[PDB]
Each structure stands twice: as structure tokens, then as C-alpha cells.
Amino acid sequence: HDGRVKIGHYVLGDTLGVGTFGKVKIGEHQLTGHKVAVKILNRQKIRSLDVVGKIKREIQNLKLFRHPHIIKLYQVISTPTDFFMVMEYVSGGELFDYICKHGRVEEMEARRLFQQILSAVDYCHRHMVVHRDLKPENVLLDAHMNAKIADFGLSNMMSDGEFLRTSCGSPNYAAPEVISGRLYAGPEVDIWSCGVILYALLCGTLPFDDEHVPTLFKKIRGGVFYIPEYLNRSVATLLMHMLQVDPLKRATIKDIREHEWFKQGLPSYLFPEDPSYDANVIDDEAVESEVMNSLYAYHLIIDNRRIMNQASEFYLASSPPGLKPHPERMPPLIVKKAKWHLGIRSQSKPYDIMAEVYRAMKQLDFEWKVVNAYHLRVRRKNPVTGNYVKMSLQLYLVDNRSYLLDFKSIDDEPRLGSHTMDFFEMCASLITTLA
Amino acid sequence: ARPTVFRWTGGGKEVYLSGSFNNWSKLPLTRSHNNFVAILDLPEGEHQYKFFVDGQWTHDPSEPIVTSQLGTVNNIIQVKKTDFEVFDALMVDSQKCSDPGPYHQEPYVCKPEERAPPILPPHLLQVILNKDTGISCDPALLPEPNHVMLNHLYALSIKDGVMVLSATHRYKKKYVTTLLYKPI
Amino acid sequence: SNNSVYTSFMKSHRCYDLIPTSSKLVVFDTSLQVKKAFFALVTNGVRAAPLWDSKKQSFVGMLTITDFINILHRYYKSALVQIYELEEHKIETWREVYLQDSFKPLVCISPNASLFDAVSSLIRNKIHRLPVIDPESGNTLYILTHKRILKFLKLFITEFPKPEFMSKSLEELQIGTYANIAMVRTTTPVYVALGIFVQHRVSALPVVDEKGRVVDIYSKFDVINLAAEKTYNNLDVSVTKALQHRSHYFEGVLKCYLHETLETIINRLVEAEVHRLVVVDENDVVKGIVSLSDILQALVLTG
Ligand SMILES: CC(=O)N[C@H]1CC=C(c2ccc(-c3nc4nc(Oc5ccc(C)c(C(=O)O)c5)[nH]c4cc3Cl)cc2)CC1
Ligand SMILES: CN[C@@H]1C[C@H]2O[C@@](C)([C@@H]1OC)n1c3c(c4ccccc41)[C@H]1CN[C@H](O)[C@H]1c1c-3n2c2ccccc12
Ligand SMILES: Nc1ncnc2c1ncn2[C@@H]1O[C@H](COP(=O)(O)O)[C@@H](O)[C@H]1O
Ligand SMILES: Nc1ncnc2c1ncn2[C@@H]1O[C@H](COP(=O)(O)O)[C@@H](O)[C@H]1O
């Protein structure tokens, strides 16, 4: 008999490539010849790096995900030595190879591919996931030239009040703060990478490239890149906004969706709140047994959601760039103004601040956990409610001579009292003691 | 079905697998690029196996070994029920790692390296209450907040012994920016 | 045919559906001075604020502009003398003298509770504000009003068949009060106007000139401008002088006719974002007042 390497009825063949974690091999069905992509993850190698939780979360996300521009995960086969991830196979290969072969991608096809990439990116961000490794090498193409993002890894979840500092990605596609090794929010980091992809599609070159690595990162931090004469004035402004050095000034998916160049020939089924989206995409919200293509109440929720979403100015405020005012607007106090600040600010030494924090907490009978020299997990038992109030303290650097102590509530387990009031009162006690 | 992977990482131009399940008979392994593999359907329990590389008996040193009474050194792999379900397998890999403590009123000792607090993210300075909402909108309304500034405290400078605190909290898909005027 | 379609709608929708995506809530500690609290309502642009008792560790009540009216009318003496009670009283000290022989517990709603329950609660307790408190965390999420309920219902009128009452006139349906209408003259002092809002518990007083025409309206909301302009110490001034600040960007008193259909009254109230309209006949003689309280009581509770 032949020594054919078989896994879950699939015959393993040539290696398609090596990702951030694991080896990817082609799989063809023993009976039909159906092609799949099998990512093999060595169990001991996962234990050796202590990224079990990362692999566990990576599998969880790819199972839930359902998007036409993200590589679909069919099944995971567990063996005593390895993990076999059976995925959707795409014959077209890397977008990087397509850009190289044609030298430069035409405006019509470049926009079509970018619209698909941004749709897949928006799906991840709405599902609290950030890829952190967007590049034409990680963007695959199907027989019908449709872009499907892949190589989830070097990626992490997005939680409320938390930031990500891990430096992930290739230097040419990494944002200025990743290069700098600074804390960041998830979405603007992926948008910078998409900006480089759009530049690479339309030009066939990188906006920030150099042989000398320190010069390359100086180029990224400076944000100075060539805008060739063949690029139209409209697409030039989009690239300039997406590749903005300042993350607060940087373009959002909402800004790109509104941009005149991006809007052209954009299908009505790619983004939410679009005429064809509600009719072509199944809402995750399930209300346990599944009933499809049979009469009866899911669409009633879809209709009700559409009315409320259409009714803007009712659920959200409209920031200003004649106009009737609201009858309940109240006049200014009499020529008086006030400004809010994030936290108590000190100009003294970092350990001088921390020593005062420990002295203030012990006088207030607080119980704390030392996570980092500048990061604590503080607790206090409320006497009336008989519950525990949890919060997180973190010292940051505002400027070279200026510091800040950040206060953040821990949402875990107050029916008798109030969780938000418990946090404010715990903060007020600490601020007053520090004087 | 119960698949078990037998991968020979070492060098060689000819590699055979011989184990207790094959009654110590030489099974040929197909090569890719210095990788001789075979996937076999095997039941639960301990299995003694060895490799026959280029006409010589050898073992994989990266795997457990059970030496026989006559000095026969061969590898052993124990098939486990947990090894076939991925979540169960990952559950074991977390426990096997074996790599913070209780709530204490003791201050943390100064770092031996001694280095600097992290640079404040620009996203946190985007104060929601310092922004104008427009005359037409209901004054109670606010714009959609960034997830990174949620659960974070924001305060006003103490005037006449009254402290004003604020934080943006999220209930389901909706957000609330609670303000509290509390005299000290 | 079913006239209970709006009743079934209110019973099916939770209070959560009305809460905005992003909104602000102002909370006051019961130990805070009322003058500071009334000034804080202006600087934050809010009419009402839930009260937090730190000793009991529970939400006790609400501080509205009605509390300011009640403080001014009870303690004002002259424009020559300071109102010591407004200048020195704490929220807790004021709540003790107001709830004396008339104590009141906290009237609230859960975000999981139906809107039918919220509308019923507002009518039964004769209130305008209703705090939405989550029973899990104990946090006050939003201050629910009549304006919010009707504007939400207005978005869904095209989703269900309109009942026969919508196509019927206000005279045939008899919605609103048409007897003993509380009004003020153009020269009426502010202190007098405050005395009528307490004695009658009404939210607005139409301003009528000596000839007999309704030039302006004096709402409970307009009273908070006395704190904003810091003109609360002089209540001898006329209501015309008190409303002089809004002379610009004011079309006039929003009125409605008895012959006009209920549907057009609701649309006009939702578009203007106001609490009430003055009812007049074809002859234009004032017939009465139609507030959202009368609208919601007729569309939700009566079927
Ligand atoms: C006719 C023919 O050529 N048949 C086949 C011969 C063998 C083939 C083959 C099929 C699968 C494997 C395989 N390769 C594995 N690599 C594993 O761990 C890794 C994963 C990723 C990397 C980068 C490494 C590594 O460090 O080399 C090891 N586990 C593995 C488990 C298996 Cl079963 C190795 C070779 C493919 C075609
Ligand atoms: C650096 N890029 C490579 C290109 C290559 O291998 C990688 C490592 C990278 O892709 C992200 N790999 C690909 C995929 C994969 C998934 C997870 C992690 C890394 C991955 C799949 C998934 N289905 C695809 O068919 C298939 C595809 C793959 N690669 C290919 C080369 C040619 C044809 C298909 C492939
Ligand atoms: N100025 C007024 N005079 C007499 N009744 C009024 C006046 N304003 C409102 N009402 C009535 O009082 C009730 C509640 O008033 P409101 O505070 O506007 O909700 C309703 O039945 C109104 O019709
Ligand atoms: N019918 C009306 N015509 C004109 N202004 C009104 C009317 N009803 C209320 N207002 C104004 O609307 C504002 C809010 O008051 P309220 O409607 O009680 O919330 C106040 O400044 C009132 O003077």
C-alpha cells in the first residue's frame, strides 16, 4: 500500500506557505478531489511559547466569523501531537504576487479589491478583533479575483477601557506608534496597514521603504511619502488621511465609506446599514432552534432595528462643522466656562507618586494587587451594600516633566446600591487623601 | 476514527516506523523536505515505537523513552481521550504549562532594573463632555464614545469644596456618561 | 378592526429601546447645596437630576426645576433681601421641609420593563420624569419623559394600521382640559406666576395681553433662566421682562384647532419638541390646553 498522508478524508500535498504560527499544506479529498488548506499547529511548539490562550481565542473567532472576504474555517482536527485547521482554499494565491506580475493594478480593479479588504476589516472591528498584520502577502485571491484576508495571528481581542502595546506586523506596514512601541487602540493600527495596501495596489511600490531599518522607521514617524503624478487628486487625499501620523487625526472606516473615490461602484451588500446588507446577511442575534426558509418574527427585529437606526439625532448627537435649535437648550451661566481633565496630575518623581498611593490606600483599608510597578488592582468592601468595589490604577507619562494617575472601574461581581456610584466614591476617597 | 501523527524530524534518505501496534514490523514513511511522516488510526493507551533510519535502529530524543530489560531503547506515546477534542486538548496544554496571588495591604518593593511609566495614549485625552453637540440635538445626547475611554474616570477642578466626577459606562449596546456632584 | 394597536406596541417594546446610544446623566449627592445643584443643571444643560443618598447607598428622588419654583415662592421676601434658604440649604434639608406631612418614595422603571408600564407610571403618579434604573448594577441609565415616548411611537406609526381615532377631530375625541385654564397677564409678576404653578401643578401658563390675545407662554423650563442670568433675587419683574431673553428665534405660541385631527396634533407636538399646545376654535377664542399627558393617556391606557 501507498504511504499517503491522510487527515479527515483529505490527502495532504505541497506546502502553500509558512505563517506566523504553523505550516499550511494543500489537502485534496480522497474520493472527490475537493481542495482545502490545512494549517498544521504543533502542540509542543504552542506549549514552548505559552500561546495556548492565543490559539484558543484564534479558533473561537474563526468559528464565529462568516464573511465572504475572510478565509472560512471548516473544521479543526485534534491529534496527540498536532492541530489540523481545515480551511477554504483559494487558487489565486497572494495579492502581493498579483501586484508584482502586473507591476501596477488598474484604478477600477484596485478600488474593487480595496472595497472588499475594508469590508473584511470592518467585520473584524465590529466583532472586537484586530488582525494587526494586513499586507498584500496576507491578502489572498479566489478564481473570480475576490480578495480574502487570512493568517489571523499576531492579532488580539478589543476590550472596554483597555489598550494594546504588543508590536505586531512587518515594519513597512506597521503604524508609527507600533514602530515607537507605544500603547494604542485597535482600529487605527489596521487602517494604517490598509493605507499601505492601497498605495501598493495603485503604485506597485511601498510608501515607506529603505534598506537601513532606523531610516525606514524615521520615514514612518515623519509620514513623508511620494504621491505620483498618475494618481488622481481624489485618491491622493484618501491616502493622506489613512496614512496620517496622528492616530486621532487618522481616517476611520466611516470616513473612508463617506469618501467620494471609495463610494464609486461600491456594492450595496458589503457594509452594514446598506440597502442590500439586511437582505443578503444573516444577523448574529438569534432569538436556540434554527428555522430558515419557513414562515415565522426574525424580520420584525430587522425592521424595528432599521427604523431606530434611520432615526439619527434621536439616539446620537450630531457634532457641528440657519439651523433650528432645541426648545430645552439652556443658556450659559452668568460668561462662565469649565474644562474636564482625565486624572490627577503630578510633576514629582514616579516612585514619589506611587509611595503616596500605597500610603493613601492603607489608611483607607484598601486591598491591592501589584500587577506592575505602575499598575495596581485595588479593592474595597462597601459597608452598607456588603459588596466589593474593584478598580484599576495606572501611572502614565503626560510629558517629560508631567505625569498622570488613571482611574478605571472593574465591571465584575450592586442591586442594593449602584456600581457607577461605588466607583466614583472609591475614587473621591483616594483623590481627597492624596490632597 | 483516532488519528496519531508519527513525524521523523531527523535526517536520513530511508526511514521506517516499527512499533508494538505493527508487531515490530517496518512501515515505510513518505518524505516531503527532510520530514518522514505517517498518520495512523490508533486506540487509547500507551504505545511503544522506534525508527529504522538508513538501516540503523534509532529513537526521537524529543519524545518520552521506556528502556527494556535487555537495553532496548524505544519511544512511547500514550493516546488520550482528550487529544482528539481540540477544546479538551487545549484545556490540558494550559494546565501542563504550570506558569498572581491574594489581595494584600503590603506595598510593592522598587524594581531592581529602575524603568519609566508608559506614555499616555492620545485617545484618553478625547474628553466627551468638553465637546459641543449642536443646538438642534436634545442636550442630554452625546456622540458615540471610543471603547478605549470606557470605564475611565474624568474630573473637574474642585471649586468651593465640591468634587465633580464622570465616567462613560456601557449597558448592552448603549452608553451612559454619568456625572456626580459630591461635596468633599 | 383594532384600536388597541398602540397599546399592544407599548406592551411589546421595552424601555431599553428608547434609551439613546450615547447620553449624559447628572447625579447630585443629597448633602450638596441646592443653589450649586440648580447652577449645575444649567452648565450641563439638563432639567432633572437623580438624587443619591450616600449614607443609605440608594437613589432617593429627583431634583427638577419644580424644586426651584417651590424654593423661590416659599422663601422669596424682597428684591432688597437675600433668600437665605436658597443660598445656604442642602438638598437633604430642603427635601425634609417639602416632604413634611407629604413624604414620597422613589418612582422608577427597569430597562427590561415594557413602555406600557412606563406610560402608566407617569399618568398614575402625575409625573414628567421617570428614571430608568438597571436592577442588576443599580445604575440610573436614562431619565424617561413623555416627549421621548411620543417621538419613539411617531417613528412606528407607519409600521401598524392607523386606528379610526387618528382621523377624528380633537372636539369629537375630547382630549385635554377645557375648563379652569391657569393663565398669566403680560404685567403679571414672576412671584405670582410661580404661585400658580405650585397651586395648580401645571407645566405652562399662557401669557395674555389686556386686549385678550395670547402673546407668549410661560413654562416651568423658562423659570431656570432666573438661575442662568442670576436674576432669581428679583421676582417683582413682569413675566414679559422674564421672557425678554428669548425674543430672538421665537415664532410664537404653537396652537391647534378643535376641528384638526388627532394625527396632526401628535405630528405638530413631535416636530416642535414641546410639551403642550393651546386649543382654539374656528373663532380663534381659546378653548383650552392639550399636553402629551392627555395624548399618551388617550392612546396608550384607554385603548
Ligand atoms: C507523496 C508525498 O509527498 N506525500 C506527503 C509527504 C508528507 C507530507 C507531509 C504532511 C504533513 C506533515 C506534517 N508536518 C508538520 N509540521 C508540524 O509542526 C510544525 C509546524 C510548523 C513549523 C514551521 C514546523 C517546523 O518548525 O518545521 C513544525 N507538525 C506536522 C505534522 C505533519 Cl503530519 C509533514 C509532511 C506532505 C505530502
Ligand atoms: C504570506 N502569505 C502566505 C501565502 C500562503 O501561505 C500562507 C502561510 C500565507 O497566506 C496568508 N497561508 C495561506 C493560507 C493560510 C491561512 C492561515 C495562515 C497562513 C496561511 C490559506 C488559506 N486558504 C488559502 O488557500 C491558503 C493560502 C496560503 N498561502 C497560499 C499560497 C497560494 C495559494 C493559497 C494559499
Ligand atoms: N395652563 C393650564 N391650565 C389648565 N390646565 C392645564 C394647563 N396646562 C396643562 N393643563 C392640564 O393639566 C394636565 C397636566 O398638565 P402638564 O403639566 O402640561 O402635563 C393636563 O390634563 C393638561 O390638559
Ligand atoms: N405651545 C408653545 N408655543 C411656544 N413655545 C412653547 C410652547 N410650549 C412650550 N414652549 C417653550 O418650549 C420650552 C420648553 O418647555 P416645555 O415644553 O415645558 O418642555 C420653553 O422655553 C417654552 O416656553
Residue numbers in the entry:
A (entry chain A): 7 to 293, 304 to 312, 323 to 347, 362 to 374, 397 to 475, 530 to 551
B (entry chain B): 77 to 175, 184 to 198, 201 to 270
C (entry chain E): 24 to 326
Task: Quote the original article.
AMP-activated protein kinase (AMPK) is a conserved serine/threonine protein kinase that acts as a metabolic fuel sensor and is crucial for maintaining cellular energy homeostasis. It is a heterotrimer composed of a catalytic α subunit, an N-terminally myristoylated regulatory β subunit and a nucleotide-sensing γ subunit, each with multiple isoforms (α1, α2, β1, β2, γ1, γ2, γ3) providing the potential to form 12 distinct complexes. The capacity of AMPK to monitor cellular energy status is provided by three exchangeable adenine nucleotide binding sites on the γ-subunit. Biochemical and structural analyses reveal that many of these direct activators bind to a hydrophobic pocket located between the AMPK α kinase domain and β carbohydrate binding module (CBM), termed the Allosteric Drug and Metabolite (ADaM) site, as it can also be occupied by regulatory endogenous metabolites such as palmitoyl-CoA.
To structurally characterise the MSG011/AMPK interaction and investigate chemistry for blocking β1 binding we solved the co-crystal structure of activated α2β1γ1 (phosphorylated on α2-Thr172 and β1-Ser108) in complex with MSG011 at a resolution of 2.95 Å. As expected, MSG011 was docked in the ADaM site where clear electron density was observed for the drug in both AMPK heterotrimers in the asymmetric unit. Both MSG011 molecules were built in similar poses, however, missing electron density around the 2-methylbenzoic acid indicates flexibility in this region. Interestingly, α2-Lys29 is in close proximity to this ring and was unable to be completely modelled due to poor electron density around the ε-amino group, hence it is plausible that it is participating in both hydrophobic interactions with the 2-methylbenzoic acid of MSG011 through the hydrophobic carbon tail, and hydrogen bonding with phosphorylated β1-Ser108 through its positively charged ε-amino group. There is also flexibility around the acetamido group, which was modelled in different conformations in each heterotrimer. This chemical group is not present in previously published ADaM site-directed activators and occupies a novel space at the entrance of the ADaM site, however it does not appear to interact with any AMPK residues that are resolved in this structure. We previously showed that the SC4 2-hydroxyl forms hydrogen bonding with α2-Lys31, suggesting that loss of this interaction confers MSG011 with the ability to activate all AMPK complexes, and conversely that the 2-hydroxyl group is important for α2 selectivity of ADaM site compounds.
